Amino acid sequence: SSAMWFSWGVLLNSGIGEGAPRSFSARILGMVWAGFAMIIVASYTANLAAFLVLDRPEERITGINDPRLRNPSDKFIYATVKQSSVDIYFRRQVELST
Amino acid sequence: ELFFRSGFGIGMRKDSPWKQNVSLSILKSHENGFMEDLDKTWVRYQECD
Amino acid sequence: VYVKPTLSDGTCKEEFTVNGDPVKKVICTGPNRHTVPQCCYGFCIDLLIKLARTMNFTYEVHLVADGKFGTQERVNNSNKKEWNGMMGELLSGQADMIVAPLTINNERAQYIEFSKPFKYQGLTILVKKEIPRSTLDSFMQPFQSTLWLLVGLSVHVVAVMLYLLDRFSPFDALTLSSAMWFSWGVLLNSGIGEGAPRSFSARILGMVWAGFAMIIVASYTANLAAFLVLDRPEERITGINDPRLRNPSDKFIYATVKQSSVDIYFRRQVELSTMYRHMEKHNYESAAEAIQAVRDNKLHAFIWDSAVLEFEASQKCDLVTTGELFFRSGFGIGMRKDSPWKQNVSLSILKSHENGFMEDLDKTWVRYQECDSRSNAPATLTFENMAGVFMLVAGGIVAGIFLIFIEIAYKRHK
Amino acid sequence: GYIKKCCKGFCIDILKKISKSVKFTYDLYLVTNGKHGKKINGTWNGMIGEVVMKRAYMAVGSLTINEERSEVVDFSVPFIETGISVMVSRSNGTVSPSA
Amino acid sequence: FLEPFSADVWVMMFVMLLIVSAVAVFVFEYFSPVGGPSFTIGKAIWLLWGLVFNNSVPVQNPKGTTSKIMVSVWAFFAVIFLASYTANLAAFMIQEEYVDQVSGLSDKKFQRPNDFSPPFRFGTVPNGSTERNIRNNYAEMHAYMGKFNQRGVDDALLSLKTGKLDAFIYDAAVLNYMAGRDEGCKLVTIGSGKVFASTGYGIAIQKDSGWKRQVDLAILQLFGDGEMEELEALWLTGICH
Amino acid sequence: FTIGKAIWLLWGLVFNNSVPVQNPKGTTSKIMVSVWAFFAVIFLASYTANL
Amino acid sequence: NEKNEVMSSQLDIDNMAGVFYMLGAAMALSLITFISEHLFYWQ
Numbered sequence: 001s002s003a004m005w006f007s008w009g010v011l012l013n014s015g016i017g018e019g020a021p022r023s024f025s026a027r028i029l030g031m032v033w034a035g036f037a038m039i040i041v042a043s044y045t046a047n048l049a050a051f052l053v054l055d056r057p058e059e060r061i062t063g064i065n066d067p068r069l070r071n072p073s074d075k076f077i078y079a080t081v082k083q084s085s086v087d088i089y090f091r092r093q094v095e096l097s098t
Numbered sequence: 099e100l101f102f103r104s105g106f107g108i109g110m111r112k113d114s115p116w117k118q119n120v121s122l123s124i125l126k127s128h129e130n131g132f133m134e135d136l137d138k139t140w141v142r143y144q145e146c147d
Numbered sequence: 148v149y150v151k152p153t154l155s156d157g158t159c160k161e162e163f164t165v166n167g168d169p170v171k172k173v174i175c176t177g178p179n180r181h182t183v184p185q186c187c188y189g190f191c192i193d194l195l196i197k198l199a200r201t202m203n204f205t206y207e208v209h210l211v212a213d214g215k216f217g218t219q220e221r222v223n224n225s226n227k228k229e230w231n232g233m234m235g236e237l238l239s240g241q242a243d244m245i246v247a248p249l250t251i252n253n254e255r256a257q258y259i260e261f262s263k264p265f266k267y268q269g270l271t272i273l274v275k276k277e278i279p280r281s282t283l284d285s286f287m288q289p290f291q292s293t294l295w296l297l298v299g300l301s302v303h304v305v306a307v308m309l310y311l312l313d314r315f316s317p318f319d320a321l322t323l324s325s326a327m328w329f330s331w332g333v334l335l336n337s338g339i340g341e342g343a344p345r346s347f348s349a350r351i352l353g354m355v356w357a358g359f360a361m362i363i364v365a366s367y368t369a370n371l372a373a374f375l376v377l378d379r380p381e382e383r384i385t386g387i388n389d390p391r392l393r394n395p396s397d398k399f400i401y402a403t404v405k406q407s408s409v410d411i412y413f414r415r416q417v418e419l420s421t422m423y424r425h426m427e428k429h430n431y432e433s434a435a436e437a438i439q440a441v442r443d444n445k446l447h448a449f450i451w452d453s454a455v456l457e458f459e460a461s462q463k464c465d466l467v468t469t470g471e472l473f474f475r476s477g478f479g480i481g482m483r484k485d486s487p488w489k490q491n492v493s494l495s496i497l498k499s500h501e502n503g504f505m506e507d508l509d510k511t512w513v514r515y516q517e518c519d520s521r522s523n524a525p526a527t528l529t530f531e532n533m534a535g536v537f538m539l540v541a542g543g544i545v546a547g548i549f550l551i552f553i554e555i556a557y558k559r560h561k
Numbered sequence: 562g563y564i565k566k567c568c569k570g571f572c573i574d575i576l577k578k579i580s581k582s583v584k585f586t587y588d589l590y591l592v593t594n595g596k597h598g599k600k601i602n603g604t605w606n607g608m609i610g611e612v613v614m615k616r617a618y619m620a621v622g623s624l625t626i627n628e629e630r631s632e633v634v635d636f637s638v639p640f641i642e643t644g645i646s647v648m649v650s651r652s653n654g655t656v657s658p659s660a
Numbered sequence: 661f662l663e664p665f666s667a668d669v670w671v672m673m674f675v676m677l678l679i680v681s682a683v684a685v686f687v688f689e690y691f692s693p694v695g696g697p698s699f700t701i702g703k704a705i706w707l708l709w710g711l712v713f714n715n716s717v718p719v720q721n722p723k724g725t726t727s728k729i730m731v732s733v734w735a736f737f738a739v740i741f742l743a744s745y746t747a748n749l750a751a752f753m754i755q756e757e758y759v760d761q762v763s764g765l766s767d768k769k770f771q772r773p774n775d776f777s778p779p780f781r782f783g784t785v786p787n788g789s790t791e792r793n794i795r796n797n798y799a800e801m802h803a804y805m806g807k808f809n810q811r812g813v814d815d816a817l818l819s820l821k822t823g824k825l826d827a828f829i830y831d832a833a834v835l836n837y838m839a840g841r842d843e844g845c846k847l848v849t850i851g852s853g854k855v856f857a858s859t860g861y862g863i864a865i866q867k868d869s870g871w872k873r874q875v876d877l878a879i880l881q882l883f884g885d886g887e888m889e890e891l892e893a894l895w896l897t898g899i900c901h
Numbered sequence: 902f903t904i905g906k907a908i909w910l911l912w913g914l915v916f917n918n919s920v921p922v923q924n925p926k927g928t929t930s931k932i933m934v935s936v937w938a939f940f941a942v943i944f945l946a947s948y949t950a951n952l
Numbered sequence: 953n954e955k956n957e958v959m960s961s962q963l964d965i966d967n968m969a970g971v972f973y974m975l976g977a978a979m980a981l982s983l984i985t986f987i988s989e990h991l992f993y994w995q
């Protein structure tokens with residue numbers, strides 16, 4: 001029981017478990033475990049706030065010069081109003097043929 | 099970013115006896131602040147963040 | 148084209164390549180106003196021996212006396228249109244060929260006629276990169292010196308009234324020493340300090356202090372690794388696209404070699420009008436000086452051939468080329484208009500392209516990669532970055548060496 | 562003494578592109594009597610006064626369209642939007658507590 | 661995960677500094693007037709290590725005043741160590757080293773593909789300059805390429821994704837455009853854009869014609885004027901570049 | 902164990918584990934404290950990410 | 953152009969003056985409870 005609370009208390013950084021290992025061999029393994037439980041937590045908490053919000057970047061369009069706007073694609077649909085000034089702006093332009 | 103910066107003007111036929119009086123009152127209302135007042139009451143609302 | 152002095156005998160010193168084949172060296176007759184027999188070898192020379200062997204002609208290689216690549220200077224003080232450099236020598240009959248990195252230009256193509264390129268390349272910008280300097284107090288940087296004091300001062304103010312709120316509260320208490328260790332071990336997150344504050348009042352103050360110490364440490368450690376190494380954001384330039392280079396500012400100095408293809412490219416361009424005027428002030432006589440000028444932080448950028456600039460970045464690792472290529476005109480072997488050797492020179496260049504001879508020439512001379520290349524990996528904190536904190540622990544032992552005597556003498560006094 | 566200079570800028574490039582399309586030639590000349598325009602004692606000076614007195618056909622530059630000038634000279638379509646704006650130096654930013 | 665610090669920096673904190681600090685804590689406590697079980701050097705090393713890994717591990721603290729001051733200094737160091745180590749722990753730990761299976765046209769997988777692992781499946785569109793160069797240079801590799809001859813760039817482009825073909829050898833200018841204009845940015849050119857048998861395009865004017873001199877100067881004029889750079893941006897640009 | 906020590910123990914876990922709290926006795930309470938410790942790990946990660 | 957992030961934040965007092973308000977509020981609040989708990993004991 002005191003060995004389980006040592007492993008769990010070290011992993012969760014709670015004070016639960018006050019029995020340090022007594023023997024030399026269990027003290028080596030019980031301190032590398034602390035380093036393991038520090039990398040594991042650090043890599044878990046390195047980007048946790050990003051997973052909570054879960055925001056997908058590269059969605060806003062930088063403008064008419066966006067490469068995804070330059071080429072057609074079925075995933076991205078962009079359009080205007082029929083028979084307006086935007087229609088004849090793109091129709092008359094040479095580069096914006098696609 | 100804005101492109102094709104062409105503004106909104108009143109359309110009229112070529113003859114248009116009101117050709118110059120319309121533009122002069124548009125220019126005057128620009129300097130009078132009338133269009134600035136029109137923008138505040140109709141375009142500038144700003145409901146949220 | 149490397150140039151090295153010859154030995155005392157007057158013959159080139161024998162040197163070998165990494166593979167083991169002897170390096171072919173050609174005795175030049177270039178200047179130092181005095182013409183001496185020097186030693187020449189390199190990519191262009193190695194191609195020259197191949198051209199000579201296949202097309203069956205001998206040669207007498209001599210460096211250009213003017214020292215310039217070649218540009219059209221119809222100076223109006225004499226009202227004469229003259230070429231200066233290797234272009235001038237070729238047209239004046241001094242030299243029958245130009246085996247050198249001669250950029251295929253429209254201006255030169257009118258008078259002399261080139262061959263098929265033997266090196267496809269363009270123009271890029273060479274900079275000094277950014278050396279991350281480190282100090283001994285880099286770990287004291289994320290906080291201003293003033294709130295470093297308030298952080299320390301508030302430890303003792305809290306500790307004093309933690310003990311006062313326990314000594315006089317109606318109620319195993321909290322002595323002044325145990326209050327200092329509580330308000331210090333909480334701040335540093337050390338285990339020392341085991342007496343939790345008694346009393347309702349000290350517990351409130353002793354728990355907001357823990358939250359205060361958490362924010363104080365979190366804001367201190369939020370960007371500590373950035374302060375330890377330091378770096379200039381992004382790069383100095385990213386090609387000819389940023390406003391920092393479009394117009395001069397007297398703080399960024401960019402220049403090229405005088406009387407070269409880069410001079411004509413910027414002079415003829417209509418948009419690059421302020422660039423040319425800024426470059427005209429600091430334009431260098433030779434590329435080698437401009438490479439050296441960037442080294443000792445006196446030239447901020449160097450717009451030169453991508454074939455040569457990329458070679459420098461491989462050898463001297465303190466220089467890193469930046470920006471995409473532009474004016475993609477390769478190196479052709481110049482010749483006069485008649486040039487009975489033109490047809491065979493281009494065919495031997497084309498055939499040696501497909502034969503893999505140029506690829507072998509690139510590996511032996513251009514492709515070295517002495518130092519590590521660039522990547523997106525984060526910086527690893529080295530010895531110099533962490534040297535500040537090592538003197539903090541070392542100074543924590545020396546201080547304790549003089550502290551232990553005070554503690555021993557204190558008990559005797561009391 | 563009609564000394565000759567070299568003129569370039571945003572408006573000049575527009576003038577060049579206009580000249581090719583409309584097929585007309587021109588001879589620019591800078592002002593000497595004032596600049597831009599102002600009706601002093603009922604007389605227009607500056608860039609707008611040299612079109613009033615038939616000294617030239619057009620006044621390419623930084624002329625702003627307004628009712629006063631447009632009643633004495635014909636203005637083309639605005640090739641760039643301008644107006645009145647106030648320029649000041651930046652204030653001292655204050656970090657709000659409870660951040 | 662050991663990359664955030666250099667190897668020699670790793671050594672000092674945990675071989676030189678930690679031992680000396682642990683000895684200092686033990687020495688200070690030994691001579692301290694106020695110094696449960698007695699403090700030993702093993703407890704000092706266990707206490708210093710635990711401070712490095714936050715403070716989750718149970719430890720035994722010293723009783724001397726100056727010994728606690730040294731531990732406090734080590735605690736400040738342990739605060740700095742975690743800050744600098746964990747700043748880029750995730751960034752270092754997602755780095756991927758994509759290793760190519762081939763190096764170039766001179767690779768043994770191309771020259772002698774039979775006497776190897778399951779044979780490399782590479783081919784090219786015939787009746788072109790690429791096949792001619794391989795015909796003259798690599799006689800053995802060309803014969804093996806005959807079985808995998810494709811019908812076009814588009815036909816060979818999809819054969820790479822399906823798996824029927826492994827390596828497509830073709831023009832650099834076309835392959836760069838296909839690599840740049842791609843869905844998912846999955847098709848790449850070996851050598852990070854390495855080009856073998858470096859040649860160029862060119863208008864194949866009639867032999868011994870007077871138009872060659874003027875055409876050549878016209879092409880070089882586009883280079884100097886920058887018109888060629890605009891043309892490359894308009895046509896030879898993709899989302900993978 | 903009382904209730905002030907429970908609140909003091911939970912608060913201290915939120916601010917790392919610096920303060921000298923008093924731990925409970927028994928598997929069930931120590932499991933609940935361990936669950937709160939996991940929450941305190943998430944709280945610090947989210948709070949200090951953009952501090 | 954878009955403004956680049958201003959790194960190397962020295963983090964002066966004005967940045968962190970809000971935290972010291974929290975510590976100062978607890979300092980005053982704890983004193984009030986100290987006075988309050990004396991009145992409770994007295995009466």
Ligand SMILES: CCCCCCCC/C=C/CCCCCCCC(=O)O[C@@H](COC(=O)CCCCCCCCCCCCCCC)COP(=O)([O-])OCC[N+](C)(C)C
Pocket residue numbers: 284287291292295296298299334335363364367736
């Ligand atoms: C997360 C927190 C947990 C722990 C919290 C612990 C809290 C404990 C709190 C302690 C209070 C300590 C206050 C000083 C802090 C150092 C910063 C400093 O002054 O640097 C200075 C830089 O100066 C230099 O670059 C050279 C000197 C650097 C070291 C300063 C000596 C400090 C001496 C005392 C050491 C005391 C140690 C204790 C013994 C009594 C900046 O200030 P300046 O001088 O105006 O700069 C000039 C500008 N210039 C450099 C561009 C020219």
Ligand SMILES: CCCCCCCC/C=C/CCCCCCCC(=O)O[C@@H](COC(=O)CCCCCCCCCCCCCCC)COP(=O)([O-])OCC[N+](C)(C)C
Pocket residue numbers: 283284535538539540542543545546
């Ligand atoms: C006990 C043993 C030391 C403990 C250190 C603990 C912190 C360890 C952190 C060390 C990090 C380095 C900080 C300073 C870096 C900038 C300064 C610099 O470069 O020059 C300095 C180097 O530094 C020193 O000589 C030591 C500085 C100690 C700072 C703390 C003293 C606290 C005193 C508080 C008293 C408060 C009042 C007390 C009464 C109320 C001095 O320069 P110099 O001497 O002219 O020679 C230059 C050296 N050089 C030629 C090799 C280049």
Ligand SMILES: CCCCCCCC/C=C/CCCCCCCC(=O)O[C@@H](COC(=O)CCCCCCCCCCCCCCC)COP(=O)([O-])OCC[N+](C)(C)C
Pocket residue numbers: 023024027028031032035036039700701702703705706709
């Ligand atoms: C994440 C970033 C870092 C990653 C890496 C670092 C993290 C991993 C690191 C882990 C290291 C863990 C060290 C724990 C220390 C235990 C000490 C101990 O039990 O002492 C015992 C004795 O011991 C001694 O007297 C000698 C002390 C040195 C022991 C060093 C062992 C290292 C083994 C290899 C370590 C490397 C393994 C890791 C790689 C495989 C008992 O103590 P005592 O009897 O009370 O005292 C004796 C006094 N007496 C004789 C008078 C009674």
Ligand SMILES: CCCCCCCC/C=C\CCCCCCCC(=O)O[C@@H](COC(=O)CCCCCCCCCCCCCCC)COP(=O)([O-])OCC[N+](C)(C)C
Pocket residue numbers: 287296299300323324327328331539725729732733736
């Ligand atoms: C470049 C610089 C880098 C610096 C990095 C530093 C990193 C962190 C490093 C070190 C921090 C840890 C050490 C400092 C604290 C020591 C004192 C303590 O904890 O307890 C003392 C309480 O003492 C008292 O009762 C008197 C109160 C004042 C003592 C502290 C003064 C300032 C110490 C300097 C603070 C810094 C200056 C702050 C400036 C605003 C000891 O009590 P005593 O009475 O001796 O006990 C014996 C009596 N008894 C047996 C009856 C119990």
Ligand SMILES: CCCCCCCC/C=C\CCCCCCCC(=O)O[C@@H](COC(=O)CCCCCCCCCCCCCCC)COP(=O)([O-])OCC[N+](C)(C)C
Pocket residue numbers: 346347350351354355358362903904905906908909912974977978981
């Ligand atoms: C950015 C970070 C986060 C945001 C900031 C957060 C900062 C941190 C903020 C606040 C932390 C405050 C921690 C309080 C510690 C509780 C323990 C205690 O006081 O002990 C006492 C418990 O008292 C009782 O008996 C009543 C318990 C009810 C709650 C009392 C605390 C409320 C104070 C709210 C004031 C809020 C002040 C906030 C000001 C800003 C005495 O213990 P005991 O005698 O063993 O009790 C026996 C129990 N019995 C009576 C049933 C027998």
Ligand SMILES: CC(C)[C@@H](O)CC[C@@H](C)[C@H]1CC[C@H]2[C@@H]3CC=C4C[C@@H](O)CC[C@]4(C)[C@H]3CC[C@]12C
Pocket residue numbers: 662666667668670671674675678679705
């Ligand atoms: C004195 C004893 C009580 C122990 O502290 C003694 C602990 C000690 C054995 C550990 C501790 C840290 C280890 C290094 C961590 C990282 C690297 C980088 C890697 O690229 C190569 C290995 C190296 C340098 C490790 C070497 C061992 C190391 C110094």
Ligand SMILES: N[C@@H](CCC(=O)O)C(=O)O
Pocket residue numbers: 597598623624625
């Ligand atoms: N551009 C203005 C003059 C400058 C100003 O706005 O004051 C004009 O043509 O009258």
